[PDB]
Amino acid sequence: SKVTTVVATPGQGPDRPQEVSYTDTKVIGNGSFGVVYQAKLCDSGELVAIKKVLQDKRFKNRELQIMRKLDHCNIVRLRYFFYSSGEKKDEVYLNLVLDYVPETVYRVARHYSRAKQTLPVIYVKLYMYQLFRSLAYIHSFGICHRDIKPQNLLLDPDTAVLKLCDFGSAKQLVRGEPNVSYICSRYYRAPELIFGATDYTSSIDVWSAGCVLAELLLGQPIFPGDSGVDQLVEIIKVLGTPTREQIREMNPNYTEFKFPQIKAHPWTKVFRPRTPPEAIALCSRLLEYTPTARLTPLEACAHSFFDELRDPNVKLPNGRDTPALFNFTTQELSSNPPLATILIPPHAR
């Protein structure tokens, strides 16, 4: 029972609207942005999400604009978009029909931490690797996600496919043009953001991804606190006080403020023992005060921490093959093509 039928434009096709029918409409997500539905497509029977936001008629919807440009194994796909609403309002809503994926890194991590246990490092490698691809991809367009966190990392429990989602904060950054600093979420904000910088770069996403990796290793977020001050105290307990040369590289307006004069904690006893050394080493190269020093998503994918993934004989724990991982396009590799010699091993060419 109850089939909904709407007139939608495909996400990447040509702008030519078709009838699209779907059932099993249920609310799965609600909040500020608007509402997210689950439904099943009547044709091929496939599961999809429906992000429904209010449309500003002034000019285009940034998120729609970005989703239509993107096509990537590790990013949720925009299948259709369409407009709506017929009950009692008189505003126009945009609805984005997206690929559906049932689990999130946020959930998996919560299951492990609650059960006082650690995610096997193979999953950590798998998930973080695909994240870096997704970022290397979007960054190559100049798009910055600006809200990297465990709730926006989607997972296939059986195939270990991670797909990045929620582009409702994404922005194409232009060098010299101001950006709002108040984006990005509670545990995952780069110090330049905590400092109110309006000229950050994409390296805010690498910082965040470091917070997720560190979290998956620790079983809890590495820099907690309900405020900037509190978060910064955590950051400093681990990184030490930023030098003046680092403060100015984050936000020059902040060089004269009093900071807790705390010395650098050795990165090793941040994590418990038998945490892989390559995992720690990678964290330290992501979570650097000076934005320009953080690794790039592409350089991260090539870090020795992901070597296991490159061994021909790697299998998933459940015995299946690992998901696609070496199918790099030129776009994906544009930032630094000579990396391909590490990124794509002898066996899959």
Cβ nearer to its own copies, comparing 257 with 341: 257
Cβ nearer to ligand TSK, comparing 100 with 137: 100
Q: Would you name the residues annotated as active-site residues? A: 147
Which residues, including other chains, have CB under 8 Å from residue 42's CB and lie 6 or more apart?
Answer: 3, 21, 22, 23
Which residues, including other chains, have CB under 8 Å from residue 272's CB and lie 6 or more apart?
Answer: none
Minimal distance, residue 191 CB to its own copies, in Å = 9
Minimal distance, residue 278 CB to ligand TSK, in Å = 30
| Residue 345 binds which entry of its own copies, ligand TSK, none, CB below 5-8 Å type-dependent | none
DSSP for 110-162, written as a single string: HHHHHTT----HHHHHHHHHHHHHHHHHHHHTTEE-S---GGGEEE-TTT--E
| Residue 166 binds which entry of ligand TSK, its own copies, none, CB below 5-8 Å type-dependent | ligand TSK
Q: Which stretch binds its own copies (CB under 8 A): 100-108, 122-130, 177-185, 339-347?
A: 177-185
3-class state of residue 301 by DSSP: helix
Give yes or no for residue 264 binding its own copies (CB under 8 A): no
| Residue 51 binds which entry of its own copies, ligand TSK, none, CB below 5-8 Å type-dependent | ligand TSK
Tell me how crowded residue 198 is: count the other CB atoms within 10 A of its CB: 13
- Pick the closest to residue 99 from 130, 65, 74 (CA basis): 74
Binding-site residue numbers for ATP are 28-36, 51
Which residues, including other chains, have CB under 8 Å from residue 154's CB and lie 6 or more apart?
Answer: 76, 101, 103, 104, 105, 162, 163, 164, 165
* Residue 7 token pair: 């007139």
Contact with its own copies (CB under 8 A) among 161, 232, 298, 333: 232
273: exposed, middle or buried (C-beta count within 10 Å: 0-12, 13-18, 19+)? exposed
Give yes or no for residue 181 binding its own copies (CB under 8 A): yes
Cβ nearer to its own copies, comparing 20 with 239: 239
Euclidean distance between the first and the last CA atom of the chain, given in angstroms as a whole number: 49
Give yes or no for residue 226 binding its own copies (CB under 8 A): yes
**What is the C-alpha to C-alpha distance for residues 328 and 336, in angstroms, rounded to an integer?**
12
Residues 98-157 that bind its own copies (CB under 8 A): 147
Q: Which stretch binds its own copies (CB under 8 A): 5-13, 258-266, 292-300, 325-333?
A: 258-266
Which residue has its beta carbon closest to ligand TSK?
A: 29
Q: Compute CA 158 distance to the chain's CA centroid, rounded to the nearest angstrom.
A: 20
Give yes or no for residue 313 binding its own copies (CB under 8 A): no
Residues found near its own copies in the complex (CB under 8 A): 31-33, 54, 56-59, 147, 169, 178, 180-186, 194-198, 225-234, 253-254, 256-258, 260-262
